[PDB]
C-alpha cells in the first residue's frame, strides 16, 4: 500500500543517484512494517550501496532472523560480510544456503 | 539520451505496469554499451521481477562471463538458478563464490 509507494519513490531517487533521500523514504517504509523482509533487504542494499556496510549488515541480520530458510537473504548477507572481509561468517551463511538448496531439491 | 535516463525511465515504466516499454528502454540502455555489467544486471533484475526468469539468467550469465570473480554476480545468478529448480548448477556457483572468498582471505 503506502509501503509500496514509499518503496517506489525511494528506488526512483536511488536509480537517479539520489541515495540519501531514497534512504529517508525507505526508512519510513521500514518503520511502517519493521518485519517486512523485502523492505529490510531494500534498506540494507541502499545502505551498502553507499559504502555503509555495517548498518546494512545489521538490517540483513534482522531480515535473516525473520526467516532463516530464505536463500536470497542468506546469500545477500554472505555477500555483505565477504565485502567487509568477514570470510568465515560469509562462507558459513553461503554454505547454509547451499544446504537449503540441496534439501529442497 | 544516456544509459542512466533510459534505465530509470524503464524502472518507472515497470512500476506503472508498462513492462513491455520498460524492457524496450532497458534494452536500449544495454545497446549503448553491451558489455556493461551494471546495465546487464539491471536488465536481469527487471526481467526477473516481471517473471522472465530464463532471460534474466542469460544476462546474468553474460555478466559472470565478463567478470567471473564477482561474488555478487555469482550469488545472484545462483539464487536465480535455484529458483528455477536448477539446484546443482546453483550450488556450483555458490561453491565457486565460497572458494573465491577463502582464496581472497588467504591473501
Author numbering:
A (entry chain B): 1 to 105
B (entry chain A): 1 to 107
Give the exact sentences the study uses for this entry.
One of these highly populated repetitive folds is the αα-solenoid (SCOP a.118), whose most widespread superfamily is the tetratricopeptide repeat (TPR; a.118.8). The ﬁrst crystal structure of a TPR domain showed that the repeat units are helical hairpins, stacked into a continuous, right-handed superhelical architecture with an inner groove that mediates the interaction with target proteins. Here we show that such hairpins are detectable and that one of them, from the ribosomal protein RPS20, can be customized to yield a TPR fold by repetition, with only a small number of point mutations that are neutral for the parent organism. We concatenated three copies of RPS20-hhta as an initial construct, connected by the TPR consensus loop sequence (DPNN).
M4NΔC is M4N without stop helix. We conclude that in the amplified constructs, the observed interactions are more favorable than the interaction with the native stop helix, releasing it and rendering it prone to degradation. This led us to ask whether this helix is in fact dispensable. Indeed, an M4NΔC construct, which terminates with the B3 helix, showed the same stability and dimerization as M4N. We obtained two structures for M4NΔC from different crystal forms at 2.0 Å and 1.7 Å resolution, respectively, the first (CF I) with two dimers in the ASU and the second (CF II) with a single chain in the ASU, for which we constructed the dimer by crystallographic symmetry. (a) Two dimers in the ASU of M4NΔC CF I. (b) Dimer constructed by applying the crystallographic symmetry to the single chain in the ASU of M4NΔC CF II. All three dimers superimpose to the M4N dimer with Cα RMSD below 1.9 Å.
